[PDB]
Design a protein around this nucleic acid. Sequence first.
DNA 1: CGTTTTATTTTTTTTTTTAAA
Lengths: 601, 590, 222
Amino acid sequence: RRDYAQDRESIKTFLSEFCKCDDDGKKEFVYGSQLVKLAHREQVLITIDLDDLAEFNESLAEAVNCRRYTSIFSDVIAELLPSVHAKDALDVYIEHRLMMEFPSELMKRFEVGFAHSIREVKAQHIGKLVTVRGIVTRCTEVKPMMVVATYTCDRCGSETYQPVNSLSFTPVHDCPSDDCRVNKAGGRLYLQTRGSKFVKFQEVKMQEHSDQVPVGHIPRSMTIMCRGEVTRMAQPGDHIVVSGVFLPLMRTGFAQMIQGLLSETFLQAHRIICIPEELEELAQDDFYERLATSLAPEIYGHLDVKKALLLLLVGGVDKRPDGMKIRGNINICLMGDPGVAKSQLLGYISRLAVRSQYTTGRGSSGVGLTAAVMKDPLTGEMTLEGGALVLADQGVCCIDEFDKMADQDRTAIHEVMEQQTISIAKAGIMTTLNARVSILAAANPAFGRYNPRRTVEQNIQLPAALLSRFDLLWLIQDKPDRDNDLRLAKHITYVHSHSKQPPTRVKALDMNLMRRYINLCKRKNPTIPDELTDYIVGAYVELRREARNQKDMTFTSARNLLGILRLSTALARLRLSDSVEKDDVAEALRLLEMSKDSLNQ
Amino acid sequence: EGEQFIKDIQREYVDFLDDEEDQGIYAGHVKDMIAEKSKRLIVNVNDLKRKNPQRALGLLSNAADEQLAFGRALKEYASTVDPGYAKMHEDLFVGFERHVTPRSLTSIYLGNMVCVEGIVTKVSLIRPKVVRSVHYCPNTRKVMERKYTDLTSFEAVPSGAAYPTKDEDGNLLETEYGLSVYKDHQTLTIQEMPEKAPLPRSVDIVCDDDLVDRCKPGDRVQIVGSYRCLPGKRGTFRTVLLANNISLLSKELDISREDIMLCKKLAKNNDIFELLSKSLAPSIGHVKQAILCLLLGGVEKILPNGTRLRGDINVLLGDPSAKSQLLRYVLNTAPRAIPTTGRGSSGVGLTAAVTTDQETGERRLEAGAMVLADRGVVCIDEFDKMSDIDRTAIHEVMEQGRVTISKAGIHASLNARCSVLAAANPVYGRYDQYKTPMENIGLQDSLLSRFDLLFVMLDVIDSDVDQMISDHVVRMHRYRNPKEYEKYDALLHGKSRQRHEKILSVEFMRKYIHIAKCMKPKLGEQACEAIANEYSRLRSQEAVETDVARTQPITARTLETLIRLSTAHARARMSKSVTIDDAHAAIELV
Amino acid sequence: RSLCERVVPGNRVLIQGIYSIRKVGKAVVGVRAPYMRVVGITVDSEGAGAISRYTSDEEEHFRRMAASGDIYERLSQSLAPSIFGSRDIKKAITCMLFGGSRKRLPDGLCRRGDINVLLLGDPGTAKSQLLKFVEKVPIAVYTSGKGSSTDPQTRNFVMEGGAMVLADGGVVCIDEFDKMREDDRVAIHEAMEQQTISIAKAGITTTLNSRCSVLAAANSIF
DNA sequence: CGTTTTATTTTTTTTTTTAAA
Ligand SMILES: Nc1ncnc2c1ncn2[C@@H]1O[C@H](COP(=O)(O)OP(=O)(O)OP(=O)(O)O)[C@@H](O)[C@H]1O
Ligand SMILES: Nc1ncnc2c1ncn2[C@@H]1O[C@H](COP(=O)(O)OP(=O)(O)OP(=O)(O)O)[C@@H](O)[C@H]1O
Ligand SMILES: Nc1ncnc2c1ncn2[C@@H]1O[C@H](COP(=O)(O)OP(=O)(O)O)[C@@H](O)[C@H]1O
């Protein structure tokens, strides 16, 4: 009904009259800048958004089908060359075909792209470009996709054009050529990859958020086919939001399994959005301790545990001597059953700590948290399909009540104590998998709540092999204190009468600001001046004497010294001064001492 | 356009459009300003037969063709009154409102719009199908069109085939989408309601866009439909029934703003505790006052841009043999709240490695049994005996109330707000403090605040209570009977109790539920002083005067329970406020 | 056409049909089609059992004996009509077969109209054959343990059900309670004290019940 | 210048895995 032509005039006016002076800084040509970026042979994809055309008019806020507009604008600016020879493979290869002498898509050279979920996705959504957020599933890989090949006749010579949109196809035969027409001189048909056009191609399933799905519902997935430039633009288990099109899928073939008008739909892509800049404001603030003041406000007091965590948040200790690496990840252990809200801090960290994970005391047996295997006589063979502990690299996978899972379960996790090494002689390998995950252990005491008669490993039943792999072991008990629980109570009830706990003692730090300030930290690689080396080796001995002077005491591993070394240089990442010094390790030992000497007194 | 009655038949529905029923009641400002846009009008056959009984038969022998017709008259009516609800030119199907067993559809009722009741089951995949073809001629640029059809809509099909191209001359020919519309299609089957059965025989149905899965496999319904069968037996035959509306019977409410006005006015009677505690189980001394919250679920709490705290309560207590004929009066009445077998699994929350069902299957039978009680409640027996494997799988819940397992199946997280109860048996009988409270049962005390109480249930047969037991328990046993059928009404001692037979009643009770389960009674200025002062003194003075005897679970995580008890009380009177005397209801547990 | 809805399993038939076919031929050479159809079956009326599916002189038989108030203890030598046992205590059956009364209430509960009774002892007492007769003397099944007890066609999963099948008005009397697997010993606790029935293999919940009961037989300890 | 296209299900033995007083 509407004209698909006079709109071409409208958009010519739009892009031509485009230096839109709404602010100091727009009299220059915006899409002229992008135009010349095409003339730079650089940009192969431009972009449309609601604001852009919204100011222009109000038709096309509901006209744009999303399909005809694209081919029209593409051909429109393809024939727009207001503007150098050897820039591309194919681009110069046409000149090679012209050295002795098309649709503008075959010289593609560029592209353009432009508050609901699958559940709400009402089935009158065809063609409309809509918005949904999900979770990625079943990570796959990318291959080339033809669009239009060049089936030359050789004897005749006529590089045939087979521009295709389908996903299945059929060959082109000997010759639809002019000289290979009724004029008897002809050869045969045969493509030339070099002059052919293909396109990247990434696909993966999309599962539901799991926060919307009603009481009587089961999450389901859709399919994602993103081709061309945008490939490799999301990993598995990223909570991502996509604007694209719903489009049906003409699954042609058999004439009785189809022929229902089957309509097994699918989706077309534009983008994978997943829900220094700070430097001037980072200049506004210079403090070390306020992180604890604004990280996890939900409980008053017990800062020491939190700062112990924030160190693991800090990081920044690693070296590769002798060819071999060193574990630069901290792994805390946790015993206790008070009301701590380990579940609290776990949820807090797992939210703010990007690339987080969670498992429970029996939810993942030894094969699930790591890679595993499967069985099916319908899809082919089976793979490892690693688990949370496999996936949580550059981060932490947080087990809750590792004490209660199982004794043999300590094995495979103990294997990852020596980091980045997940050996598997199961699928005919000694595979590695790079287990590069910081580890969070939290459990409860044994029968009772730290019965003072039943001593350590008298009350506990854990082999030394795992405690040795753990930098810090922490028992948490707070006996009846008349004054203690008061403050904690009124503190809790504050966000019950209210929504935001801590007033007027610090500036709260949002997830964004917190993460960004932490983002500026770890790349210092600071200086530990040489006097420490003689000094610290002395101080370590101070431990090893008061370890031996009582005979019913803890054993020690070389990691005790390696740990007390490992922690200090990390914290200088958040000092941001490349200056590992006395305080850098005096806090290390201080917190180590606080880890102990707490259960007798 | 068959035998030319078709238009006259259209007129007869258009002739539905003249006076007080049409002119006052029916449509126009009966749907359109209430703004649903859903084509489907309710028909009521007794009126149409009161006008055109011949046309009340016009369906009941040939309902193949009343449909384009009905839609035509409707678009004429709605299309010649409202220009807004008119840019949806399609069929715009309607109501069409003999119930026979799915076992008694016997060659016949072909052409008839008739009823069967049964089970929703095998609720299945959803996939749209295609109506028209908005084809374009991009050289000549004419948006031409090609409609389609199926037997599942009418009798005929077009040359149902590939979306065409290169049809006229070989010009620029291509589709246009976003306009070539589509139709949401669903498939499922129904069974007879099993109690009648002496293999009970099923039926198969097919749906459309506004008819799409109004309930779930595990529900049951009355459903009305026509009949066909397309295939050509021996040049076999197999049928399906269709052309449908929807209804449903197993729900619960003539409740406009009158019934809310009913529920408010009786509020102020202060000790409803009396009434609502003596309400469901007068067939039982004893608790019912205490039961309150296992029905109410709990309360919701969210921190800005943070996390939350789970809200609902879980308690159970007793001498052997009231405990199996007790966990009731809500299992029946409470909305969709399910206790379980007592010693059950393959369905608490596990996969149960058994791949002998469909030869594949990753999640093919991964699920539990409390998510069917999401925002409900549960009870069971035999906990005193049950396995310790999924005790693990409890400790996640009572702490969190979200299930998060990933033994390679999948890395789960799924809402649940649920509560649940337990069993008991004293492994040695009548010992509660002479020996001790704990471990006359064979039990564990790690679950301190997991459940929200340490409580007790006791008995001894006596000499002094001997005739008390006799005369009361038999007072029950003959106030069991009428005039105190096979059993008329038992009045006295509910009429000496100056009561009335529609004030002790279920719909009269849940009169005060649906709305009471909707409020947000925030805290004021009294918990803050009360709770910390008192739990501080309690966790120390529960340690003297022989009450260290029964002081097993003292925690400060209990402090949520101390609130969500009274939270129910704040919606027991629907006051968005709270008192010190509201406190006493959430201390008197002690 | 009309000869369905006529016949169910466990019956005895005479028939006339046709020997006819469905396949075609010339299967290493030609193996083919058996079946028959119906024309006009004639079924049996086997004697005295089938007051089951398809007088007042007998009421006069009934009542003039109950006119005598001598049934309570008279039929204490009838339930074992030909052999010895339970003699002075067989009077306690008078309550159970008639049962009590499933006296519903205005309140929640549906009382235990179903009520249960016991036997236990050694073999040799005719305890095998006595209850053997009791199936002959309303409706039930009778053996003990693992022996009732927890298709390749048209892709529908059949499930023939549980234990209220022949016992919902019918009641039973069986041995070997502990002489039985403990997987199928939860159900008894659900069956019996309440008929607290449910289903969980697939995702739907049979809310079944019954007016049924049991007796127990025994060869347990001492 | 005419006359024709197209479907498969259950059981084994290994290597995985999983159960009760
Ligand atoms: N001082 C406090 N700060 C913040 N929250 C608190 C405090 N004291 C109590 N709470 C609340 O009490 C609840 C106690 O239950 P919680 O989730 O702590 O179990 P848990 O202590 O993690 O159990 P376990 O330690 O046995 O795993 C917590 O959710 C927490 O929010
Ligand atoms: N105070 C009471 N109120 C109502 N009923 C009672 C009361 N006291 C006793 N009864 C009756 O006594 C019976 C006791 O047997 P019951 O069915 O409770 O066994 P049970 O407690 O379930 O056994 P177990 O707990 O060992 O499985 C109940 O059926 C109940 O009706
Ligand atoms: N008082 C009795 N009257 C008749 N038969 C009896 C009597 N006592 C024992 N019997 C015999 O006992 C046999 C049944 O024994 P049974 O109850 O099967 O032993 P068990 O219970 O060990 O299997 C019958 O065949 C019957 O002949």
